[PDB]
Structures are given as C-alpha cells and as structure tokens.
Design a protein around this ligand. Structure first.
Ligand SMILES: CC(=O)N1CCC(C#N)CC1
Length: 291
C-alpha cells in the first residue's frame, strides 16, 4: 500500500486524552515558499474568481509526534503542532507542483514537508454494540477521492498550558464529526482512544490522527439514525457495516481498492492496535484462526 505510511503506532491498545501533551508553536509552521507565498495567493484568487462562495478556515499542522519509552509512567506522547489553513493546503499539498515542493524541502531544510501546509485530519474506527465497524460512501461529485469508501472524520478548525486545550479539541472533534455525519446521539459514544497517525502519500504526505470509538447502539440502530436525517443531513451517499471478524483480512478483499488512503490508515491501525492479541487466551487457535 504505497499510498499510506504509518508515522505513529500507539501502545497499550491506544492512548486516552489524559496521557497526551501538545506543543502548539510557530516553530512548527510551514516555511515560506522559496519564491514567496505570492504563488499560494495567486491559486486562491483564481479559485475564488470561479467559486466566490468558498471561504478560508484555520487548521492544525502536524510537525511531528514523539512517543515516550514504552511501559513508562507520566505523559506517553508529545504532539508538535503549528497552524495552517484551507488556502495554504490548496496552494501546496493539492498543487500540481507538490512533488517539486517536497524535493526543495529536502534540499533546503532536510525535511520533505517543510514547504507543505500538512493540515491534521481526524478519523475513527467506529465499532457497534454487535461488533461491526462503520463505513461511508463518498459522493462521486466531490474533490477528494470521489466515489471511494471512507470512515467518519474531518479536519478540525482551532477555537501543556495551551496544549491541554488543543488535545481536548482534537478528541472533541472526532466525536462531533461522528454526531454531525452519522446522526448519532453523543451519549451513545465512548471517550476516544488514539490508535496512531497515518500519512496520505497521494496528497503529498498530509497526516490524520486515527481513533477507536465504541457505540452502545447495534448496526441496525446506527443505520436508522443515519437514514432518518434524510439526504441533507450527511455529505456521504450511503452507510454500510463489516463484522470486526472480517476487518482482519480486509486488505485481501475487493473492498481494499475502493478505500481512500485515510480510511486504509484507520483499518491498518485498528488491526495492529485493537486486533492482534498478545495473551494466551485471545491468541489460542480457535479464537485467532491461522492464515
Ligand atoms: C483533499 C481535500 O479536498 N481536502 C482535505 C484537506 C482539508 C483541508 N485543509 C479539506 C479538503
């Protein structure tokens, strides 16, 4: 799967909010382009003169994420974050020249991402009470990965002593994205666990934090809530469910070729961090069938 790379695999079956620190610093921002940020401004102008109802929004930028030594006490992860925008994304990662910016970043800064917006996404492996994961079909008329399969998620918009508020907005945003798109009540959802961070190599290396969330409703009740919003309550065109039993071999199915890179990231991290048992009981052959 060349279109997805793992940046972080979390320990302990995944990390809760209270074990993560963030450092939000202008040292973690995109570097100005070599010939100047006028090139981003020019792309934006062209776009607004065709689609004048579009608007900019601030986004978090991922610089890097450092895991503590495994088995340690105290905070287990440091997220190094900067700020970027939807405009900066359109002028860098989305640009036809994005590969030239990556080579220039290697040359000038020893950092393939130095000249890229790299907005941070969130996604969820969302499990039902009857042990299915939740999938969504993308519209064939959208910009990103038209007609492909996705999981619930989005790109959070901003508003350890500013840090803890930032970690809170990241965990809050994955629940809000599930409530807005799947139409589920907030009280049916568990507190999220962070599984890891995946990069989309088809969008010049931008990263998404992938979370595990449990729902107290069955697949049938989740479907009812999604459909009862009507066509205007969701951006997706359909919902469907795969047994957690069968997610283990999803990369061997015809479904895999239809998954967008960020959904492939969520399923790889679910399989490595929540699947793949380590103990004698769950590792026994009748519960973990060989092949
Ligand atoms: C690929 C695409 O269109 N996206 C994903 C990145 C996000 C930002 N910023 C919103 C739009």
């Amino acid at each position: 799967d060349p279109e997805v790379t793992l940046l972080l695999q979390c320990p302990g079956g995944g990390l809760p909010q209270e074990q993560i620190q963030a450092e939000l610093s202008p040292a973690h921002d995109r570097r100005p382009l070599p010939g100047g940020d006028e090139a981003i401004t020019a792309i934006w102008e062209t776009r607004l003169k065709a689609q004048p109802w579009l608007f900019d929004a601030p986004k978090f930028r991922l610089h890097s994420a450092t895991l503590a030594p495994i088995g340690s006490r105290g905070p287990q992860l440091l997220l190094r974050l900067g700020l970027t925008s939807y405009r900066d994304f359109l002028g860098t990662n989305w640009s036809s020249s994005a590969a030239w910016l990556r080579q220039q970043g290697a040359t000038d800064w020893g950092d393939t991402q130095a000249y890229l917006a790299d907005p941070l996404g969130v996604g969820a492996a969302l499990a039902t009470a009857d042990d299915f994961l939740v999938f969504l079909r993308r519209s064939r008329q959208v910009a990103e990965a038209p007609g492909l399969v996705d999981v619930p998620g989005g790109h959070p918009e901003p508003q350890d002593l500013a840090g803890q508020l930032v970690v809170h907005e990241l965990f809050s945003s994955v629940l809000q994205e599930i409530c807005d798109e799947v139409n589920l009540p907030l009280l049916t959802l568990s507190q999220p666990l962070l599984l890891g961070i995946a990069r989309n190599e088809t969008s010049a290396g931008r990263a998404s934090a992938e979370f595990y969330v449990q729902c107290s409703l069955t697949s049938e009740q989740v479907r009812k809530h999604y459909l009862s919003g009507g066509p205007e309550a969701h951006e997706s065109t359909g919902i469907f469910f795969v047994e957690t039993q069968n997610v283990r071999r999803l990369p061997e199915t015809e479904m895999w070729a239809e998954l967008c890179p960020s959904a492939k990231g969520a399923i790889i991290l679910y399989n490595r961090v929540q699947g793949s048992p380590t103990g004698a009981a769950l590792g026994s052959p009748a519960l973990l069938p060989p092949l």
